[PDB]
Design a protein around this motif. Structure first.
Motif, PDB file in Angstrom:
ATOM      1  N   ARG A 172       0.718  -0.966   0.318  1.00 54.03           N
ATOM      2  CA  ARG A 172      -0.083  -0.015  -0.007  1.00 54.03           C
ATOM      3  C   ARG A 172       0.961   1.220  -0.034  1.00 54.03           C
ATOM      4  O   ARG A 172       1.628   1.229   0.844  1.00 54.03           O
ATOM      5  CB  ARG A 172      -0.790  -0.184   1.234  1.00 54.03           C
ATOM      6  N   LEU A 227      -4.070   2.094   6.770  1.00 58.03           N
ATOM      7  CA  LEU A 227      -4.906   3.036   6.422  1.00 58.03           C
ATOM      8  C   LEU A 227      -5.971   3.529   7.289  1.00 58.03           C
ATOM      9  O   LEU A 227      -5.984   2.666   8.334  1.00 58.03           O
ATOM     10  CB  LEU A 227      -5.703   2.822   4.875  1.00 58.03           C
ATOM     11  N   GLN A 285     -10.903   4.383   5.125  1.00 53.71           N
ATOM     12  CA  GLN A 285     -10.729   3.499   4.013  1.00 53.71           C
ATOM     13  C   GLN A 285     -11.117   2.140   4.193  1.00 53.71           C
ATOM     14  O   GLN A 285     -11.156   1.403   3.560  1.00 53.71           O
ATOM     15  CB  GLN A 285      -9.396   3.482   3.679  1.00 53.71           C
ATOM     16  N   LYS A 328      -6.374  -5.634   0.659  1.00 51.43           N
ATOM     17  CA  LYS A 328      -7.775  -5.876   0.556  1.00 51.43           C
ATOM     18  C   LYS A 328      -7.951  -7.164   0.788  1.00 51.43           C
ATOM     19  O   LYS A 328      -9.198  -7.473   1.195  1.00 51.43           O
ATOM     20  CB  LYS A 328      -7.733  -5.738  -1.177  1.00 51.43           C
ATOM     21  N   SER A 338      -3.940  -1.567  -0.864  1.00 51.36           N
ATOM     22  CA  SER A 338      -3.584  -2.278  -1.858  1.00 51.36           C
ATOM     23  C   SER A 338      -3.977  -3.493  -2.082  1.00 51.36           C
ATOM     24  O   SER A 338      -4.559  -4.118  -1.131  1.00 51.36           O
ATOM     25  CB  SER A 338      -2.003  -2.029  -2.307  1.00 51.36           C
ATOM     26  N   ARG A 356      -0.113   4.662  -0.503  1.00 50.82           N
ATOM     27  CA  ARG A 356      -0.562   5.942   0.183  1.00 50.82           C
ATOM     28  C   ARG A 356      -1.658   5.635   0.858  1.00 50.82           C
ATOM     29  O   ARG A 356      -2.758   6.292   0.632  1.00 50.82           O
ATOM     30  CB  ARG A 356      -0.716   7.032  -0.958  1.00 50.82           C
ATOM     31  N   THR A 357      -1.645   4.843   1.819  1.00 47.56           N
ATOM     32  CA  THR A 357      -2.863   4.508   2.804  1.00 47.56           C
ATOM     33  C   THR A 357      -4.024   4.308   2.001  1.00 47.56           C
ATOM     34  O   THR A 357      -5.080   5.009   2.256  1.00 47.56           O
ATOM     35  CB  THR A 357      -3.141   5.478   3.828  1.00 47.56           C
ATOM     36  N   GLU A 358      -3.926   3.401   0.842  1.00 51.10           N
ATOM     37  CA  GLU A 358      -5.329   3.071   0.205  1.00 51.10           C
ATOM     38  C   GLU A 358      -5.538   1.895   0.127  1.00 51.10           C
ATOM     39  O   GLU A 358      -6.195   1.404  -0.929  1.00 51.10           O
ATOM     40  CB  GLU A 358      -4.976   3.434  -1.174  1.00 51.10           C
ATOM     41  N   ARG A 411     -14.481   2.721   3.059  1.00 54.69           N
ATOM     42  CA  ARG A 411     -14.901   2.565   1.515  1.00 54.69           C
ATOM     43  C   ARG A 411     -14.530   1.333   1.331  1.00 54.69           C
ATOM     44  O   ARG A 411     -15.410   1.043   0.443  1.00 54.69           O
ATOM     45  CB  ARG A 411     -13.709   3.627   1.206  1.00 54.69           C
ATOM     46  N   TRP A 412     -13.599   0.681   1.834  1.00 57.73           N
ATOM     47  CA  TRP A 412     -13.583  -0.840   1.234  1.00 57.73           C
ATOM     48  C   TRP A 412     -14.811  -1.494   1.519  1.00 57.73           C
ATOM     49  O   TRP A 412     -15.194  -2.212   0.544  1.00 57.73           O
ATOM     50  CB  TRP A 412     -12.456  -1.686   1.970  1.00 57.73           C
TER      51      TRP A 412
END
Lengths: 66, 66
Positions: free
Chosen positions: A4, A41, A45, A14, A10, A6-8, A48-49
């Motif tokens: 990951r 994150l 997030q 996931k 990856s 930028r704290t998203e 959002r996931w």
């Protein structure tokens, strides 16, 4: 995409969230920040996931590795 | 320890398996290999994580981040 950046969350991340899917009291106000600690994150997030996991096709959650 | 170097489920991975803990039909003959695909280690290391998660103190599983 492997880590990951930028704290998203990856792909490597996931997967982990798909193992919870709320079943172990995850995805709650005290386990979103729990994951964040070593996940990378923030609770944003996580939510959002969470919704993008099921809402992608109508909320039935047929996607696990997709 | 940040990534898994030799299929041994490093800290980044240990987290993920703790999210499942068998609750989403994980840790079964068809989900051990499921994880392996993008997790990085084989079903053997899934079962080793699994028992070492609870058996560390007597099988009550009080360890989540430990």
């Amino acid at each position: 995409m492997e880590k990951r950046p930028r704290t998203e969350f990856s792909e490597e991340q996931k997967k982990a969230l798909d193992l919870a899917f709320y079943f172990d009291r995850r995805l709650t106000p005290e386990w979103r920040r729990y994951l964040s600690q070593r996940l990378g994150l923030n609770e944003e997030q996580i939510e959002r996931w969470f919704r993008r996991k099921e809402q992608q096709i109508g909320w039935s959650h047929p996607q696990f590795e997709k």
